Amino acid sequence: DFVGTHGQLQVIGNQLCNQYGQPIQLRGMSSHGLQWYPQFVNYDSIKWLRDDWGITVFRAAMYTDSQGYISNPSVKNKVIEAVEACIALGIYVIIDWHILADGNPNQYKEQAKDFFREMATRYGNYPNVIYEICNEPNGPVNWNNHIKPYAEEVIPVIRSIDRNNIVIVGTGTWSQDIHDAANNQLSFDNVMYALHFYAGTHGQNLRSRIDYAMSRGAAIFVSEWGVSDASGDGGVFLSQSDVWLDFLNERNVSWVNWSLTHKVESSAALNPGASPNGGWTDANLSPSGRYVKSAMRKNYNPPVPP
């Protein structure tokens, strides 16, 4: 019962902490698009990731555009299923308003308010829940006059129901521009800024940005990363993945791998034919999957309650 041990999460300075104010790192897996690969998101597969890999957080990627929530709102049911599974299993869950093709978060801001208002009404009293209000802002979309104003409209709605659970806020250039966010941070409490990286693409320059942002007091959550290049394909970069995870582990920065699906691409955790309900043998895991399972509990020492 990981949530039973660590309870309510909170941000102190630049660090995510547990209910006793102890720095804590989460690690886990992201679903792919719930409108495209829902069959891998269920109580069975999440329990297996808990028991066999040792994840402590699971991310439900609910695309808004690209046949997702806006055009097919029944995908909301997969979010409800993932959240209720994680409450039953005692792990944390990220509810991800997964913008991408809709690179400006303000495009569906009214629908985001209504959606997060219902999620907080349903689950805001559970410590498991983490809100991620805009996956990857991208394009000609900036912190100071697009993302920050969006966040200042959505978060008061969440906080009007759920006073304390963590909100992760995406940053510019597909959640790379955490230095803009760090130089002009949100006033709310218990907020973190998202940093996304891919080991085939991003290197020491982006790692330096994490140190710059944390030095200004900003808390950073790696809510999506892959072993591939940033297209999600292009082979697997395990040596580079090792430097990134060691760097993040050293700094207690939480991380969530992309993605739990059998799509035929380097970042996918599962080979075609892997069961939708977990129990995967090594033959069922892709190279990325085998590596991420190995990394999930490497050098993982969560705090001991007082």
Question: Does residue 46 lie within any of the structural domains?
Answer: yes
Going by C-alpha positions, the residue among 38, 39, 26, 116 that lies closest to residue 72 is 38
Distance (Å, whole) CA 122 – CA 162? 10
Residue 193 domain-assigned (yes or no): yes
* Position 306 in a domain: no
Catalytic position from the list 84, 110, 224, 250: 224
Q: Is residue 305 part of a domain?
A: no
185 to each of 14, 21, 169, 182, 297, how far by Cα in Å? 12, 21, 11, 5, 32
HSE value, Cβ hemisphere, 13 Å, CA-based, for 161: 20
Q: Which two tokens stand for residue 3?
A: 């949530």
Q: Give the integer Cα–Cα distance in Å for 208 and 13.
A: 19
CA distances from 181 to 104, 124, 142, 167 (A): 16, 26, 10, 14
Q: Give the number of domains in the chain.
A: 1
Rounded distance, CA 248 to CA 245, Å?
5
Joined tokens for residue 14: 């630049």
**Residue 304 domain-assigned (yes or no):** no
H-helix segments, the chain: 2-6, 43-48, 76-89, 109-123, 148-159, 172-175, 178-182, 204-215, 238-250, 287-296
Query: CATH no. for residue 253?
Result: 3.20.20.80
Rounded CA-CA distance 80/179 in Å is 33
Could you check whether the bond before residue 259 is cis, i.e. omega within 30 degrees of 0?
yes
Which residue reads 């900036």 in tokens?
A: 142
Cα–Cα dist 252/27, whole Å: 10
How many CB atoms lie under 10 A from the CB of residue 204?
A: 10
113, 153 Cβ separation under 8 angstroms: yes
In a domain, 301, yes or no: no
Are the C-beta atoms of residues 208 and 189 closer than 8 Å to each other? no
Q: Which domain holds residue 33?
A: 2-296
Experimentally, how was this structure solved? X-ray
Q: Which one from 81, 84, 110, 136 is the annotated catalytic residue?
A: 136
The distance from CA 294 to its chain's CA centroid, rounded to whole angstroms, is 19
Residue 130 DSSP code:
E
First-to-last alpha carbon distance for the chain, in angstroms, is 17
**CA 228, CA 238: separation in Å to the nearest integer?**
9
252 burial level (CB within 10 Å; 0-12, 13-18, 19+)? middle
Q: Report which DSSP code applies to 61.
A: E
Is 177 domain-assigned? yes
What are 270's strand-pairing partners?
285
What residues contact residue 59 under an 8 Å CB cut-off, 6+ apart? 28, 29, 30, 31, 93, 94, 96, 132, 223, 224, 256
Q: How many residues does the chain have?
A: 306
- Please say if 132 is a catalytic residue: no
